[PDB]
């Protein structure tokens, strides 16, 4: 009777996937 | 009872729209 | 008592002030 | 005890840990 807080959770794990991409900066050329 | 936990949710979405900006580096810095 | 959930919120506001720095990518690379 | 809400918190502390890495850009630039 309150999936509002849980629903938002999906957003937390989601950003993680993208976080991996940004890593590209820390490797090539440095 | 107060929307204390909910209010934080608004902060979660903000990350998504901004994340799109940082992507400019990954895709092409022009 | 259950300030466990609230505590997490405090950390959320923190990421915001720092996000400002990330802007550098844009402010530099058109 | 329905640690569903707590699990989400773990994601918050994670950001901070990685967040310092990204800092490498300003604190140094080869």
From TrEMBL, chains A, B, C, D:
<comment type="similarity">
    <text>Belongs to the influenza viruses matrix protein M2 family.</text>
</comment>
<feature type="transmembrane region" description="Helical">
    <location>
        <begin position="3"/>
        <end position="15"/>
    </location>
</feature>
<comment type="function">
    <text>Forms a proton-selective ion channel that is necessary for the efficient release of the viral genome during virus entry. After attaching to the cell surface, the virion enters the cell by endocytosis. Acidification of the endosome triggers M2 ion channel activity.</text>
</comment>
<comment type="subunit">
    <text>Homotetramer; composed of two disulfide-linked dimers held together by non-covalent interactions. May interact with matrix protein 1.</text>
</comment>
<protein>
    <recommendedName>
        <fullName>Matrix protein 2</fullName>
    </recommendedName>
</protein>
<feature type="site" description="Essential for channel activity, possibly by being protonated during channel activation, and by forming the channel gate and the selective filter">
    <location>
        <position position="15"/>
    </location>
</feature>
